[PDB]
Amino acid sequence: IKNTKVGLALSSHPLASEIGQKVLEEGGNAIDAAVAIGFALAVVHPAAGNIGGGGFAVIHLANGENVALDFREKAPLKATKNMFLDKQGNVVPKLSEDGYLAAGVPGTVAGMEAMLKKYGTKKLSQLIDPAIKLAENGYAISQRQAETLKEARERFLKYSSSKKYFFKKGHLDYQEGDLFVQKDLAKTLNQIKTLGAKGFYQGQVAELIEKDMKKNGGIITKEDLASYNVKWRKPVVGSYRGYKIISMSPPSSGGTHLIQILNVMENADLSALGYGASKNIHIAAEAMRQAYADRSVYMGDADFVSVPVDKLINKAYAKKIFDTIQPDTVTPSSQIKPGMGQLHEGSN
Amino acid sequence: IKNTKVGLALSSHPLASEIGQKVLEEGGNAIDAAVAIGFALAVVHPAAGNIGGGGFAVIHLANGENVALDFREKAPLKATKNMFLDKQGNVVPKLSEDGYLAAGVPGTVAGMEAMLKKYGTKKLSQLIDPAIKLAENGYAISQRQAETLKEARERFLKYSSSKKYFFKKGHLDYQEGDLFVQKDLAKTLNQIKTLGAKGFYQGQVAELIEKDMKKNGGIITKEDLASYNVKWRKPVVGSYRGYKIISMSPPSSGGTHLIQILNVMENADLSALGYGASKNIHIAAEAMRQAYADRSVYMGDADFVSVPVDKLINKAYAKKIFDTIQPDTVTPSSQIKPGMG
Amino acid sequence: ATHYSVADRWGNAVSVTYTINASYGSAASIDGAGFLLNNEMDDFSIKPGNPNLYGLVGGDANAIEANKRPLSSMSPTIVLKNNKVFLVVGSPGGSRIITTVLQVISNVIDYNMNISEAVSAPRFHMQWLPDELRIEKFGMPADVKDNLTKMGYQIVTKPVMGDVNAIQVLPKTKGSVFYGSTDPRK
Amino acid sequence: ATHYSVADRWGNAVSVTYTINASYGSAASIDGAGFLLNNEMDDFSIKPGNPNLYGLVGGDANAIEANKRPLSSMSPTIVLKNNKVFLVVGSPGGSRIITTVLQVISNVIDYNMNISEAVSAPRFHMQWLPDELRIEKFGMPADVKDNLTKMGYQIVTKPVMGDVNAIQVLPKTKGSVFYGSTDPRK
C-alpha cells in the first residue's frame, strides 16, 4: 500500500478504506477523510465500527500543533459507584457487559462532528453519503464477519432489537456472501446527514434511544444525550530515541503507559541484540508489568480524579523502573508496588 | 486467496494469475490454465517467464496418476565438454553467463504444447490469445520490474537485439508505469498460435534463431531446434509423515534432494519443539549439508550418466545420515563424504 | 474497537481508535435506530479488585461516577521525525492495545523494520495481572521460550493480538511517500 | 526461474517451475523474435570444481555433452494426503530452491501452519559449500543464533530467499476449499 499524491486512509475494512481514500482524492483533508471512515465503519464493521460507542482522535496539524479529541462515552447522569453490585456487594453477573445498563452515553457522532467543525474542510452531508449508501443498498458478509456474528448469537438472542437486525428471517445466522442491508441504520444516518449531531442527540432518534432504554432497564434518557459533550485535550507527548511520540491522554491510559514503557526500554540498547531477543523481551515485559500495576491505582478520568500523568511519563521515573529490573530474572507481579514508592503525594 | 468452486491458478504476476484463473472459471482444467500462464508470463515477467528457456511440470491427475514433464533445455549438437574453457583448461570469463553461447536449446514452447495435447481440453490458439494481447497492446512496468531492468542494463547493452527490445528510444531504462510493448514477441507468439510448436522450432522463427546465433558466435541451429524433444518422465516419489511427496526427477536434482532431506528430518519429532527451534534447524541443516555434497558427485542428466536416485531417496540411507547428527555440534563440510561411503 | 489512520498531503495526520467495547458491544440495539449499544461501562472498575473483560483491575480512580468517562487503553498515536509525520499507528485489543502499539513503534525505531514488517512481526504481552507472558502461535521459538522461562516467566500461547492499521511517511527528494499496512492477523 | 501452481475442481494439480536461468537469462535476445535467450548452460559444470552462479560445483555427472540437459535445482512439487491433492508448491532461487520448498512443506506438516504462514515464515539455507548457514533479516533471534553458533555454524544474513506460489486444498462438506499464497518476499 503506497501513495505519493493525497496520502493514505487505512482501516480494517476495504470498503471503508476506499471511502476515506476517495475523500483525499477529491481534496478533503485528513480530518474530512477520518469522518467519512468513522461513518462507513459504523455500517460495514458493526462488531467495532459504530455510532453507538465512542473513541479518541489524535491529530497532528500542518501548522505543527497537536490536539486530542475525547469522544469517549460518559457514564449516564444517573450512574452510581455500586450500580453493578447486588445487596451483598458482589458483582451482578453480566450486568456491566450485556444489555442496556452496560451502555455509556455514545460519543462517536458528536466526535465526528466536532473534529469536522474545527479542522475539516468538507460538509457532513458529503462525507456521510457513502455510509448511507452502504446501509441502504447493503454489502456482502465476509468469512470473518460470519464467524463473529455466530459467536455473538446467544448474546443477540436476548434482545428483540438485535434479533431483528443481526439475523435473517427465522433468527438465522448470516453466512459469508449474504447481502446485509440495514435500513433503520440508514434512517438514523440520514437524520445526522440533515441535522448533524443534533440528529442523533435530539429529536426522533433521541426519542428512540430513551424509549428503548426505558423498555429494557437502561438509564440513558434524552437528558443524557442532550448533556453529551466532547472534550478537546492536550495529547500526552514524549520522546523515544529522537522521535516524538504523540498519544492519547486521560481518559485513556494508553498514551501515558505507551510513553512510560518506551521510556524504560530507552535505557537499553535494544538494537544491539535485535528483534525477538529474550534479553530485549525481558526489559520490555518488566516495563509493562510495572506500567499495568501503576495503571490499576493511578489511572482514570482526570476530570474526576487526580491522575499523575507527568510523573508517569517522567524519564527519571522510567529510569528508576529500569534500575529495579533484575538481570535474567523476573519480579513476580505479587511483589510489584504500584508507583514504586515514587507516586506518593504525602499520605494521600 | 481463497476459492471454493473452480480452484486456483497462482503465479508471481497478477496479470498472469488472472489469465489462469479465468481459464478455470471458463471450465478449463489445471493443464489448460497452466499453459495460458506459461505464455502470459513469457510476456509480463521477462526476467524469468519465457519462451527462450525451459523447465518442468509435475502433474497429478484426477485419475490418481502422477507424471513429470521435462522441457529442460538441451546442450546444442555442437556443444562439447570443454567449450567454455581455453586450450589450457582456463574458464573464459562470462562465456557460460552472458550472450549467445550461454544458451541451451529452448524447451518451453515444446513443453507447453506437449502438456496441452496430452492432458488439456482447450486449443493452444485460444489459450495463447491473452499473452498475445499483452505483447501487442502492452502492460505497465511494475516498481520491482523497473529495478530489475535497471540492474540488467549493463548486460543488455552488450547485445543490439536486447537494446532494441528492453530499452526505450535512446537506450533509456523503462520506468515504473511505462507501457511496455513487445511487437516482435507478439509476432513470435502468433506463429505459435497459427502453427503450434513448429511456429517456434521451424520456419521463420527458426530462421531468425539460427541466423542471429551465427552472427553472434552462438551454435544453436535449425537442426537443434527441429530435434528438440520433451520427455515424459516418472516423478520422484517419497513419503513424509503419512503424506506423499511428488517432485521432479532427473534432470532436476530438486525432487531427489527434497525427498532425501525430508527423509532425514522424519527421524526426529520436529513438532515437539516447533518452528524455528535451533534443535530443529540443526537437523534440517545437517541433512541439507549431506544432500548438497551428494548432489556435487551423483547428479546429472540420467540419459547420459548414472544417477543413484533410488539410493538417495532410500529411507535407510537417510537414517544413516540422521545417526551422524550430533545434538550440540556440526559436522563440518570438510568432513562430509559424498554418499558417506 | 477498530483503528484507522489517515495522513494527507498538507502534513495533517489523524489517528482514530473507536469502539463499542466488546465484539458487538452490549449486543443490544436501539429499536428503530439500527445501531448496537456499547458496553463501555465494563471499562470502569465496578468493584475494587474485580477483573473486567480484559483482566484489568482498579479501585477509586476508575470507579464509576455519573458523567465520568470509563478508563480506556486505546492508544491512537502519531510519531514525528524532525517534526514531520513519520508514523500514524494504533490498534484494538483492550488491555493489549498499549503493548501492541508500542511493539510496532519499537520494531520501526529499534530494529529498522519497514511498516509492513513492524506490523507483521509477532507480539508478546504482559499486563501484570494475570502474571503471564502472553505470546502468539509461531511467534517465539523454543530457544527464546526456554531462556525466558528460566528467568521466571509463565509463557502462554493465546489468539493473535491486535489489528494494526498504520502509515509510515518518508521524505522523497520532493514531497512525501506514504506507506501503509493493514494487519495480517485480521 | 518463476514458479506457478494450479489446482482445479476435479483433482488435477499442475506445478510448474520454468526459467531462463539468471535474471533476464543470457541478456541476449533473438533479433526479429523478441525473446530473451536462456543462460542455462551455466547449470552444467563447465570445469570440475568450478562454482557456478549459485556456488554449485560438479564433475563428470553434470559435465557438458551434446544434447544433454544441464542439472537443475527446480523442485515443482505436489503433496498428497489420503491420495488427494493437499499442497502444490515450488519456488525459484537457484541452489536455494530445494531448501525453500522443503521448509514450506515442513512448516505445514510439522508445525501445522496454514499455507500463508508456511510461505511467510523466515527461511534458512545450508548448501555444504560455502559452509555457512544462510538466514534472512529478522528471521532468527539472538537466542537461536547463539545456540547455532555454539554448535559451529557460521551464520550469515543475506537477501531473502525464493518466491513461493503455493496452494493448499482442504476438504469441506461439499468438495474442497482452495487456499493460495504468494510470497511476501516478491
Short mmCIF file of C-alpha atoms in Angstrom, two decimals, chain C residues 16-182:
data_model
loop_
_atom_site.label_atom_id
_atom_site.label_comp_id
_atom_site.label_asym_id
_atom_site.label_seq_id
_atom_site.Cartn_x
_atom_site.Cartn_y
_atom_site.Cartn_z
CA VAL C 16 -8.54 7.29 15.44
CA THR C 17 -9.46 4.33 17.62
CA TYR C 18 -13.15 3.89 18.38
CA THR C 19 -15.23 1.13 19.81
CA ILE C 20 -18.41 -0.30 21.27
CA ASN C 21 -16.03 -2.25 23.58
CA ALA C 22 -16.78 -6.00 23.27
CA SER C 23 -17.45 -7.58 19.89
CA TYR C 24 -20.89 -6.18 19.02
CA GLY C 25 -20.74 -4.13 22.25
CA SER C 26 -23.56 -4.86 24.70
CA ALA C 27 -25.28 -6.94 21.98
CA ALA C 28 -28.40 -4.78 22.40
CA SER C 29 -29.53 -2.47 19.60
CA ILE C 30 -31.71 0.64 19.81
CA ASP C 31 -35.01 -0.46 18.27
CA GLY C 32 -35.99 1.67 15.26
CA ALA C 33 -32.47 3.11 15.01
CA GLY C 34 -30.45 0.10 13.78
CA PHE C 35 -27.24 0.54 15.82
CA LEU C 36 -25.66 -1.52 18.60
CA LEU C 37 -25.06 -0.09 22.05
CA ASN C 38 -21.59 -0.10 23.56
CA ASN C 39 -20.77 -2.00 26.74
CA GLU C 40 -18.24 0.66 27.70
CA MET C 41 -19.43 0.62 31.33
CA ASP C 42 -17.32 -2.51 31.84
CA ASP C 43 -14.22 -0.36 31.32
CA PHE C 44 -14.88 1.16 34.73
CA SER C 45 -13.85 -0.70 37.85
CA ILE C 46 -17.25 -1.89 39.02
CA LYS C 47 -15.89 -3.21 42.34
CA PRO C 48 -12.39 -2.81 43.74
CA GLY C 49 -10.03 -5.56 42.53
CA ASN C 50 -12.65 -7.12 40.23
CA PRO C 51 -11.06 -8.06 36.85
CA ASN C 52 -13.00 -6.81 33.83
CA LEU C 53 -13.39 -8.30 30.32
CA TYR C 54 -9.62 -7.76 29.72
CA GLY C 55 -8.40 -8.78 33.19
CA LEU C 56 -7.90 -5.13 34.16
CA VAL C 57 -8.45 -4.04 37.76
CA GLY C 58 -8.92 -0.80 39.65
CA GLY C 59 -10.07 0.97 42.74
CA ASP C 60 -11.03 4.60 43.35
CA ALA C 61 -9.51 6.36 40.33
CA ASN C 62 -11.52 4.39 37.80
CA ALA C 63 -14.63 3.83 39.88
CA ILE C 64 -17.98 4.79 38.36
CA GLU C 65 -19.28 8.33 38.86
CA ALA C 66 -22.15 9.90 36.91
CA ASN C 67 -20.89 11.60 33.70
CA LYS C 68 -17.30 10.32 34.16
CA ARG C 69 -15.61 8.61 31.20
CA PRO C 70 -14.51 5.00 31.81
CA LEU C 71 -10.75 4.47 31.56
CA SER C 72 -9.58 3.25 28.13
CA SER C 73 -6.44 1.59 26.84
CA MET C 74 -6.92 2.96 23.32
CA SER C 75 -3.64 4.33 22.03
CA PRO C 76 -4.09 6.21 18.77
CA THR C 77 -0.61 7.52 18.18
CA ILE C 78 1.39 9.74 15.87
CA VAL C 79 5.20 9.57 15.74
CA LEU C 80 7.16 12.58 14.44
CA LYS C 81 10.65 12.62 12.98
CA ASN C 82 12.25 16.06 12.69
CA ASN C 83 8.76 17.49 13.39
CA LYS C 84 7.32 15.73 10.35
CA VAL C 85 4.75 12.96 10.40
CA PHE C 86 6.62 9.65 10.48
CA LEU C 87 4.16 7.07 11.86
CA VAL C 88 0.41 7.01 12.35
CA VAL C 89 -0.44 3.92 14.35
CA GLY C 90 -2.96 2.26 16.69
CA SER C 91 -4.86 -0.93 17.38
CA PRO C 92 -7.77 -2.55 19.10
CA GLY C 93 -7.24 -5.23 21.74
CA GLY C 94 -8.47 -3.95 25.13
CA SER C 95 -5.57 -4.30 27.58
CA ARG C 96 -3.34 -5.49 24.69
CA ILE C 97 -3.63 -2.23 22.80
CA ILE C 98 -0.82 -0.47 24.68
CA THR C 99 1.70 -3.28 24.20
CA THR C 100 0.69 -3.91 20.56
CA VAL C 101 1.20 -0.28 19.62
CA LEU C 102 4.49 0.11 21.44
CA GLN C 103 5.88 -3.05 19.82
CA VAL C 104 5.09 -1.74 16.31
CA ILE C 105 6.82 1.55 17.14
CA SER C 106 9.84 -0.26 18.65
CA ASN C 107 10.11 -2.55 15.61
CA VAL C 108 10.48 0.52 13.41
CA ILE C 109 12.75 2.61 15.63
CA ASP C 110 14.88 -0.07 17.33
CA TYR C 111 15.05 -2.74 14.61
CA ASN C 112 14.65 -0.72 11.40
CA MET C 113 11.68 -2.72 10.18
CA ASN C 114 9.54 -1.13 7.47
CA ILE C 115 5.91 -0.61 8.47
CA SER C 116 4.75 -3.91 6.93
CA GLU C 117 7.49 -5.86 8.77
CA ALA C 118 6.77 -3.95 12.00
CA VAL C 119 3.05 -4.80 11.84
CA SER C 120 3.51 -8.46 10.82
CA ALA C 121 6.16 -9.25 13.49
CA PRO C 122 4.91 -11.49 16.31
CA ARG C 123 3.80 -9.75 19.51
CA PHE C 124 4.14 -10.57 23.19
CA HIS C 125 2.19 -9.14 26.12
CA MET C 126 2.49 -8.70 29.90
CA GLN C 127 -0.24 -6.85 31.85
CA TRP C 128 0.84 -7.69 35.43
CA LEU C 129 -2.42 -9.43 36.32
CA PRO C 130 -2.64 -12.15 35.17
CA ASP C 131 1.06 -12.79 35.77
CA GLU C 132 1.84 -14.41 32.44
CA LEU C 133 3.81 -13.65 29.33
CA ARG C 134 1.28 -13.90 26.51
CA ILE C 135 2.60 -14.87 23.07
CA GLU C 136 1.27 -15.78 19.61
CA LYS C 137 1.36 -19.12 17.72
CA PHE C 138 4.70 -19.46 15.85
CA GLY C 139 5.75 -16.20 17.49
CA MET C 140 8.55 -17.32 19.78
CA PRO C 141 10.96 -20.19 19.12
CA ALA C 142 11.92 -22.84 21.73
CA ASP C 143 15.32 -21.29 22.49
CA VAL C 144 13.73 -17.94 23.38
CA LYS C 145 10.87 -19.57 25.32
CA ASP C 146 13.42 -21.65 27.29
CA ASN C 147 15.51 -18.65 28.24
CA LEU C 148 12.51 -16.58 29.28
CA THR C 149 11.05 -19.47 31.30
CA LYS C 150 14.41 -19.70 33.11
CA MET C 151 14.03 -16.01 34.04
CA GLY C 152 10.71 -16.98 35.66
CA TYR C 153 8.07 -16.15 33.04
CA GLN C 154 4.98 -18.33 32.67
CA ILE C 155 4.53 -18.31 28.91
CA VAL C 156 1.06 -18.87 27.43
CA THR C 157 0.11 -19.02 23.76
CA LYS C 158 -3.20 -17.31 23.09
CA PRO C 159 -5.02 -15.98 19.99
CA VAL C 160 -3.34 -13.28 17.94
CA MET C 161 -3.29 -9.78 19.42
CA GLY C 162 -4.47 -6.64 17.73
CA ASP C 163 -5.31 -5.27 14.31
CA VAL C 164 -2.90 -2.52 13.41
CA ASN C 165 -3.61 -0.14 10.57
CA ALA C 166 -0.56 2.03 10.20
CA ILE C 167 1.04 4.60 7.91
CA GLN C 168 4.75 5.39 7.54
CA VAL C 169 5.60 8.68 5.81
CA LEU C 170 9.05 9.13 4.33
CA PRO C 171 10.64 12.16 2.72
CA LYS C 172 11.26 11.88 -1.02
CA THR C 173 13.58 14.25 -2.93
CA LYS C 174 10.45 16.38 -3.46
CA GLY C 175 7.39 15.65 -1.30
CA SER C 176 6.41 12.56 0.68
CA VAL C 177 5.87 8.88 0.02
CA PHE C 178 3.06 7.41 2.17
CA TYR C 179 3.32 3.67 3.06
CA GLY C 180 0.50 1.70 4.62
CA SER C 181 -0.03 -1.67 6.24
CA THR C 182 -3.08 -3.47 7.46
#
